[PDB]
Description:
Helix content is 41%, strand content 5%. By secondary structure, it is mainly alpha-helical. It has helices at residues 12-21, 27-39, 70-79, and strands spanning 60-61, 64-65. It is found in: Membrane. It comes from Schistosoma mansoni (Blood fluke). Belongs to the tetraspanin (TM4SF) family.
Amino acid sequence: GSNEKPKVKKHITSALKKLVDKYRNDEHVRKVFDEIQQKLHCCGADSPKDYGENPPTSCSKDGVQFTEGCIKKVSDLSKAH
């Protein structure tokens, strides 16, 4: 019944890994991961290969490719204050 299990910020790495995997599973995830990928200038969860060989447009911008992950990128700004 009563069960409160919080999630640590570091857990974001676990969710991201699943997000990139469930990209073609949920539409809401695409638009979300897409906006986050651009704003964070990253591809996939831990890498662009997570998509295979054809990542979303959010992976590129202005004709450029983002050779950086999201799990690490999110941390860069996360720790930054």
